[PDB]
Design brief:
Number of helices of chain A: 2
Number of domains of chain B: 3
Radius of gyration of chain A: 11 Å
Number of domains of chain A: 1
Strand content of chain B: 5-15%
Oligomer: heterodimer
Entry title: Arginine decarboxylase in Aspergillus oryzae, ligand-free form
Distance between the termini of chain A: 31 Å
PDB class: lyase
Chain A: L-tryptophan decarboxylase PsiD-like domain-containing protein
Strand content of chain A: 25-35%
Structural class of chain A: alpha+beta
Largest interface: A-B, 33 and 67 residues
Distance between the termini of chain B: 18 Å
Assembly: dimeric
Order of helices and strands of chain A: EHEHE
Number of strands of chain A: 3
Strand order of the largest sheet of chain A: 2-3
Number of helices of chain B: 13
Keywords: arginine decarboxylase pyruvoyl-dependent decarboxylase agumatine Aspergillus oryzae, lyase
Strand order of the largest sheet of chain B: 7-6-5-9
Helix content of chain A: 10-25%
Structural class of chain B: alpha+beta
Helix content of chain B: 25-40%
Shape of chain B: globular
Largest sheet of chain A: 2 strands, antiparallel
Order of helices and strands of chain B: HHHHHHHHHHEEHHEEEHEEEEE
Chain lengths: ~40, ~375
């Protein structure tokens, strides 16, 4: 297996996470490694 | 020079408290079905530590068995985890929880599982010819249609660019086919296999997924230190990052106060390597010794979500604070970086998948590029 990614408070203000990651109960499959997790806004 | 299973036997038998716990953690497992059998339901449940040790010693020269080939409908949570199968119900007892939190027990388990890893990395399968390691995989059922289809399906579930065959997805040695289990020389090479070029393209986004993994939690506004043992397991940065034992990480704990923690789970049939989630300069890297089979009280017998048939599955937030794990802190406020400050990556072991292997490109002071392979989990301690 398990792992965490940790982000700073000021950085989270600038980032849009994908919903499957930010709201994990909605996820039904793996996320693909190297694919988008968060983008700058 | 001593067999690490024998060192463990001596630890148990030469300490009165551990001797007590090593009986009580089995006595506290109910006699009645389904606990008369291990969680796979395929074998009787082990009821004493001597049988446990006998099996641990035997397992030192076994790869995990793909038991779903001949038993497709039984619980599959422990595919890959032969030690876990033996201790899964004991882990869920009050005495078992105490036993698997003992630092000396966990040093012994570390040494046993690392001896196991030596075998899993051995292309001879301990002296059975240059193909011994490969043959052990085939004998264990991994080249069956059931296993290969499972591995292919799991890889395809995360992408729209679906491939028909294992060989289009994962790198493996030359002349590999299903019949020779893709000529993987040993379990370790199969376990840490790489994707073929272009199968996992790096996205333009500032942050990409570091693992082929299933979202678990996303927590905002996390605290410096917290009561991670209470229901729901609030994250405790101070404990997770190891500021307990390394003052050098304490400034990074402070800098993550108010930040966000995202957590995701890697299944046994998923890719197990680690890829850089961001571009930046490594400013801190550590490995932290800890537990293997420690799970929550809620995950045990009488617990509100227990006993877990595949512990520590439902305890994943909890074990980020105590399990064998690693820490990487990347500074993205550098040339070529996304300028989103410091990003942390904390791989956390589960049971006998607890070898946290940082590749040399993550040495403190090096710059990693988003999408670079930077390490891997291995079966081991």
């Amino acid at each position: 297996x398990t792992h965490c990614l940790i982000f700073q408070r000021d950085a989270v203000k600038k980032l849009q996470f994908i919903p499957k990651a930010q709201y994990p109960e909605i996820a039904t499959t793996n996320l693909a490694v190297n694919s988008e997790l968060a983008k700058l806004t | 020079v001593e067999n690490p299973v024998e060192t463990f036997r001596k630890l148990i038998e030469n300490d009165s408290t551990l001797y007590m716990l090593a009986h009580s953690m089995f006595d506290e497992v109910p006699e009645k079905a389904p606990y008369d059998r291990d969680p796979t339901t395929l074998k009787k449940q082990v009821r004493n530590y001597k049988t446990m040790l006998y099996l641990f010693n035997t397992l030192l020269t076994e790869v995990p068995e793909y038991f779903l080939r001949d038993n497709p409908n039984v619980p599959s949570g422990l595919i890959g985890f032969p030690f876990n199968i033996i201790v899964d119900w004991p882990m869920g007892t009050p005495s078992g929880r105490q036993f698997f939190l003992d630092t000396r027990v966990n040093k012994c388990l570390k040494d046993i599982l690392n001896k196991w890893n030596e075998f899993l990395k051995d292309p001879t399968a301990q002296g059975n010819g240059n193909k011994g390691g490969n043959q052990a995989l085939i004998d264990a059922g991994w080249s069956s249609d059931a296993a290969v289809e499972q591995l292919v399906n799991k890889a395809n579930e995360s992408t729209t660019d679906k491939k028909k065959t294992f060989s289009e997805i994962f790198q493996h040695p030359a002349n590999g086919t299903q019949e020779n289990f893709f000529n993987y020389a040993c379990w370790d090479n199969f376990f840490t296999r790489r994707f073929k070029d272009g199968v996992r393209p790096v996205a333009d986004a500032a942050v990409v997924n570091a693992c082929e993994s299933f979202p678990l939690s996303f927590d905002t506004d996390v605290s410096r230190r917290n009561t991670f043992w209470l229901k729901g397991t609030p994250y405790s940065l101070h404990d997770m990052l190891g500021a307990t034992q390394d003052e050098r990480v304490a400034s990074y704990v402070d800098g993550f106060v108010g930040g966000s923690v995202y957590q995701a789970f890697l299944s046994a049939d998923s890719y197990h390597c680690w890829n850089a989630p961001v571009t930046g300069k490594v400013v801190y890297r550590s490995l932290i010794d800890g537990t293997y089979f420690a799970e929550t009280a809620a995950a045990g017998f009488g617990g509100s979500n227990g006993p877990d048939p595949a512990g520590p599955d439902v305890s994943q937030r909890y074990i980020t604070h105590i399990a064998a794990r690693g820490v990487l802190i990347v500074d993205t406020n550098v040339t070529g970086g996304a300028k989103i400050g410091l990003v942390g990556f904390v791989p956390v072991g589960m049971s006998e998948v607890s070898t946290c292997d940082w590749f040399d490109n993550t040495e403190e002071g090096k710059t990693i590029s988003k999408g670079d392979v930077i390490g891997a989990f291995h079966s081991g301690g």
